[PDB]
Amino acid sequence: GSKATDSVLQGSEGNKVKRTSCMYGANCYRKNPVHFQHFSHPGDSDYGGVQIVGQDETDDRPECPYGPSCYRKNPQHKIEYRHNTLPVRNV
């Protein structure tokens, strides 16, 4: 076999959208199917866990509502909020 990046998309979860990582994962005491219809869990094909919701949302402080495009001119603002810069790279 060659270097195949093809990810396991085949399965019962061949739905038309990908759910959001259960921020609690397997630690959520909700086992009702609805909990899984919008959140993916550790074992789901739709699970990724690379989202802030699933790994961490805080880092250290609240996030700047304007992102890195925040034009709010204040050093204290930059101190209180996270100006989350994104890779947006094609590697």
61 is in an annotated binding site: no
From CA 55, how far away is CA 24, in angstroms rounded?
9
* 64: number of Cβ within 10 Å: 17
Note whether 23 binds Zn ion by CB under 5 A.
no
Note whether 64 binds Zn ion by CB under 5 A.
yes
Position of minimal CB gap to Zn ion: 70
Note whether 70 binds Zn ion by CB under 5 A.
yes
Which residues contribute to the site for Zn ion (CB under 5 A)? 22, 28, 64, 66, 70, 72
